[PDB]
Amino acid sequence: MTKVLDVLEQFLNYHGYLYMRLDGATKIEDRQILTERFNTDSRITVFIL
DNA sequence: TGCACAGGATGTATATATCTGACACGTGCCTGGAGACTAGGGAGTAATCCCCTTGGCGGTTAAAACGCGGGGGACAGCGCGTACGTGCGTTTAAGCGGTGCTAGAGCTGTCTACGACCAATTGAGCGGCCTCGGCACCGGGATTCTCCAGGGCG
Question: Could you say which protein family the record assigns here?
């Protein structure tokens, strides 16, 4: 359920990590970019889907 | 001579007998009130089936919702003048009293077409079905149609 996603964002934001969320509420243009951004070497530890 | 008075000669509200109009009461013939027989139309039930819901997750889209620029159109202010508002005298014609009529309005027998009421047939009209040619939606392309920037012109 999507109601866990916002709570998980408030948690990951509480502990201060670098994350990116991908779900049905995003657009098509921000999808592939958030993908390649995670695949390439970066500081993002967790990727929410 | 100038003056007050006693009585007639006219008004005038005042009180009395008199003329319509409308409320009030006493009838009798077309109405209602009521009694009995028929019966089909209304109250009641047994499936039924059939479309209409129950509850809520997500993903995504098209429609709803908000936000700012400003352009033009609503809108306040104000002067003008002629178009009705207001006030006179002069006229044509309706109101109304009264009249001689009639021709059409209005209540009543005859019968006779002629439509109300009831069996027998059916065929034209209604439930069921399954197709295809007209219809729905959109590309291609030409056509028009409005928006904006000089500039030749004030």
Answer: Belongs to the SNF2/RAD54 helicase family. SWR1 subfamily.
